[PDB]
Amino acid sequence: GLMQFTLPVRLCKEIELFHFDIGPFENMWPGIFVYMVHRSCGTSCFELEKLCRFIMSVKKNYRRVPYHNWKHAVTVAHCMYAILQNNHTLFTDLERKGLLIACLCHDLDHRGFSNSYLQKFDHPLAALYSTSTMEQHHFSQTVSILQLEGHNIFSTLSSSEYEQVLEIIRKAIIATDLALYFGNRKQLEEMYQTGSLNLNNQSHRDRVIGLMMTACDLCSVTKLWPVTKLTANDIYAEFWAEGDEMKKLGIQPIPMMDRDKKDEVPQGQLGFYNAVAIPCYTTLTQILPPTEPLLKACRDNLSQWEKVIRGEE
Ligand SMILES: CC(C)Cn1ncc(Cl)c1C(=O)Nc1ccc2nc(-c3ccccc3)[nH]c2c1
Ligand SMILES: [Cl-]
Ligand SMILES: [Mg+2]
């Protein structure tokens, strides 16, 4: 109980920053997550034995894919940690608890393929879950692990609190379906601009948490340029494999998934920053001003992609 996780001095300091990279030492990532839970939530939020058993079972249910892997899970949890720590008073005890767990679990059992590829392949998951196919799967996997013997980190919660935290996690994980982000941000933009935004309105809070989930999920675009650039290679390794699998179904893939259109990556990144990332962090900064460093880091990376196009790199 008087047992803190401690990090080396450079990590202790840099983990507080939005652009922190969790490093290449896989064996430190569980400790990095527990450290963030302890500071974000409290050393009391979870029984350490159950938490450690939960974390190791979550890790085991991430696959050895180039990008949608255990490192992505802990990376997305860290961005959520940074948002929560910079917005101390805005979130409930249940929300702090639920949201770090939601982030760790949000891509459980990902195969490196989009909802669209599952649909075209006619994968069994696409018949079970007609929309947000992988995201409904990720939530199902989260519940399955929570129900393993000795894995119920939420055991000390009252029945009502338990039902509330699972509903926070479910909504948070479904919100990582990027297809749903466009309409969520549009509604939040209108609400902010007309001054109707009310954080006491549960349906408004749901929308704000949804945007936080998009922001943490896309956080590779908010790292220092060398991290952003090297992460893009892992993302494209998955996209191009999916494109190969589309060609095997006799379907021409979209250019972003076609390894033959590698040359159009820089312009593709520009479209993504302008259509998704920048708008996402802009609306997040309007609602939660202390998240401005994410928007600043995103604009810096946009200007690096612009320099790549101009042959300056
Ligand atoms: C991991 C994912 C599921 C979500 N994600 N997370 C972080 C980041 Cl970045 C992304 C992401 O979606 N990046 C992304 C988005 C749209 C793109 N369009 C092109 C393109 C277009 C024409 C020619 C060549 C390339 N490349 C793209 C890359
Ligand atoms: Cl603190
Ligand atoms: Mg996902």
Ligand SMILES: [Zn+2]
């Ligand atoms: Zn993700």
